[PDB]
Amino acid sequence: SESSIENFLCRSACVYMGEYHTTNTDTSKLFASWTINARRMVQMRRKLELFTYVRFDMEVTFVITSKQDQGTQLGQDMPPLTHQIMYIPPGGPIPKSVTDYTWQTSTNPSIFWTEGNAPPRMSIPFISIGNAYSNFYDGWSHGVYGYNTLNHMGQIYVRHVNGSSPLPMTSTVRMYFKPKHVKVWVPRPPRLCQYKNASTVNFTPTNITEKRQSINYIPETV
Amino acid sequence: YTSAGNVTCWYQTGIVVPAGTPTSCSIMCFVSACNDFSVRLLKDTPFI
Amino acid sequence: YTSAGNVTCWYQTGIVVPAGTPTSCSIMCFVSACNDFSVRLLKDTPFI
Amino acid sequence: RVRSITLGNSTITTQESANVVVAYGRWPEYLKDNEATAEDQPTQPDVATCRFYTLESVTWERDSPGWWWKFPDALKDMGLFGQNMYYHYLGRAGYTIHVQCNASKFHQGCLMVVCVPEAEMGCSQVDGTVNEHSLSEGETAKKFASTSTNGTNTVQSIVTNAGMGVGVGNLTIFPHQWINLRTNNCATIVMPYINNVPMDNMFRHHNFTLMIIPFVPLDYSSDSSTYVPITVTVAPMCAEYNGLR
């Protein structure tokens, strides 16, 4: 009952933590971004690799905390801060500044949230023109080995929702991810070697198991 | 220092061959679970 | 320069024997006709 | 107690005491009619795709780590089934694979024969990428190694990790068969079409991989033959392509 597929896979986890400012002199530090896949979380990756094909919905919750920068200026009286969390489907426009037009496109779903309230949450369906996702692909992208374009799942972007000339602030977002209504096909053996990077199956050769003293050795009984 | 059962194998007779066959040989073991197996308290694995 | 089919035989693995058996060996072929065979225009044979 | 099987203009002979593994319980079949009714009409050759194709034999010696083939494109030069790979943009098929040995009662050894879907392989250099030639050579087999390999763009082919980063004793999770020279010398595996889409292009994707791996090495004594031949025969089943009209 605890070994069913749902109870084994449907569990929440922190998969990305990022920081972003209201004012800066880099302009890439003004927003945070994440590409959705399940290959940079080493514990979820291994449980997912026991199968060849998967199908699930996604649920994402966001925990967001702010701070005034230790730069100099005190005595402030500020209202609570507002944030915008945008999801981009596969085949959507990507922003490059925080002032871009794509933060207003009608087909990118978006959430507006102010601090002090309950943590925000959105639910994404199975988004693929194929019939399942694949954890393993023995092919070419059209050319990269092992990468097929049916596994695109979208992106998430987060910014502040101030007006003009805002006050300096630093925020941190943590994303909690959970698959739901899961189905799996074609079981596989468990990964025996350590993972080396996030896109390949590359590995250094590993021992089959650890040694004992002799082929007869059994430890003394208590 | 286990409190578990054990399995051992012994030579009852020895291996006998005709002329022209290899002298040494090998045995292989396979393990599996039977239908009445149960598990509880999902946790994290100690291998990665 | 025939316009006929052909048959060939290939070594997939090689022959493996124990100790004390002959090394080489032989194959034999037998031919026959199946029930649907027909012949026409009796003539003289070219062998005597 | 010998059966003779004819597919098309091919004939092979097997033993009626054979054992057959149907991969996941599923026999091959046509995608029925109406996944994509209107402008996706398929066609099927059924001419000289259903016929036995026999590759070259491989030679099992005392130190042989193993062999592997990729499917398809092990058949890209095989008569009509290979012609159809160039004329058509999409296809699909199941297969029947026979593996046979020729050995005596004075030999000994043990083989695993396994069919692995999506067998993605690793590079010999951890921050490298695999080449197209090092993954397959068509109807010629690639070889596993007994130690860890080097060189650029090569599959890391140490046989204990099977090129995939797992323990090779655990490949029994896939459709597999054992050949123990003591008790049998043949193996049949029937594989259906397995993908996450109904059809696909047959040149830049390897559906599955056939592997043959000795777990107990070949042994013989005084004047037996020093090798054993292994032979592989493949018959495509229920092949189907996009319509051209």
Added chain:
Amino acid sequence: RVRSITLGNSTITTQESANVVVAYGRWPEYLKDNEATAEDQPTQPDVATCRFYTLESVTWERDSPGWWWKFPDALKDMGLFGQNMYYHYLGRAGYTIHVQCNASKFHQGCLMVVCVPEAEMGCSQVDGTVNEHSLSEGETAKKFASTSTNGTNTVQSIVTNAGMGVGVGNLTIFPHQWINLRTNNCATIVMPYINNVPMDNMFRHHNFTLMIIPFVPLDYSSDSSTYVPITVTVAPMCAEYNGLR
């Protein structure tokens, strides 16, 4: 065509094509109820007496005259069945004996396996008496000799007279089985309890004797193994003792 048999926490494996000799047509059983109704109440262990006990293997070489064991007291150190021999004053039981060989098709030889009730043995000195150690050593086998023996208090163990003063070709009168390396390698004998009283004390009386005797010696050639192992396994049946309350 292999059967797997479990008695208690023991498991062994045999072939389903076995042949079984039931000694005189009689299966073992309990003395029913009322030979000695009033103050002779028995009890039965049925706990870990019904279980396979396996002795050490013996080694059959080119010049092996033979082996013998005494029953009981070949089992006086065997777990619970041996504990019950010390706690109880009277007992009885039947037995199942399996004998197995491990040999190849390049070996040859022939064994007789016989169970002899009341196998009273003679001394090496005609006006002498036999010792208790020279009759048995428990779970270790005694050995027959190929010539006539000497020394005091020893059984005269020349193998042609089997220590009993008869011709050894005539022991087929007892429950017996042949093992011909050419055709089989196993033998099962089921022995009931045979005495002239219903119960008895198990320490100063040997109910029966198991003997194993080669009639055609072991032969092999160039680089086969030079010995063959023989293995004996015993399961007590319907054991029964005097009540203690």
Added chain:
Amino acid sequence: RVRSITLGNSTITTQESANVVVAYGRWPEYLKDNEATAEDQPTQPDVATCRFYTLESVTWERDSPGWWWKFPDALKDMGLFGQNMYYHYLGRAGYTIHVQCNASKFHQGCLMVVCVPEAEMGCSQVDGTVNEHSLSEGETAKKFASTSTNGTNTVQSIVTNAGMGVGVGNLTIFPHQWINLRTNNCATIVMPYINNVPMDNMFRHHNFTLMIIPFVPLDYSSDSSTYVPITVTVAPMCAEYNGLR
């Protein structure tokens, strides 16, 4: 799976898995009654003609071209059936022929066993004539040669032409059986009486000829026996003679 057959005061043992060739579909039988009703009355011995007669074994070595016997007169010294050949002026009979080999699983070879009616043979000299001794020696076999022979009055016995001027690969047109040391070692042929008259004299006519011819020579290795014995056993069936009263 062994059968034991007794004819008269003879007993032989065969395997119940035998295969039997009845020559042209016809079992032997008596010419019924009334071909020659009035003054042609026959009689039948049925005493010690129906019984197994066993000849001497022949020795199959590495270079053995083959053997042949003539029927009858291979039995002119065989007890009663031979006495009847001298007492009676006309006769007839059918036969059952068993041929057996004694070989191991480490030997190899292949034999044809064929029964040929009217096997008229040619002379070694083209303008010559064959002798009576060179056609048969009774219960001793004649031998084929591996090259062409010479000398006066001798059968030209090169084995590829079988002494008859035909190709030896075509003798399968006659009642025949194959003995492949790999799969069987025995052959039974049941021959009826075949002539163009109902009875005949048994001294100046050879009804048929039994031939045994190796097509793949005997091979063995290191310390196996260097020969293989072949044994022939004959039982006459439904013998019948002219009445004497």
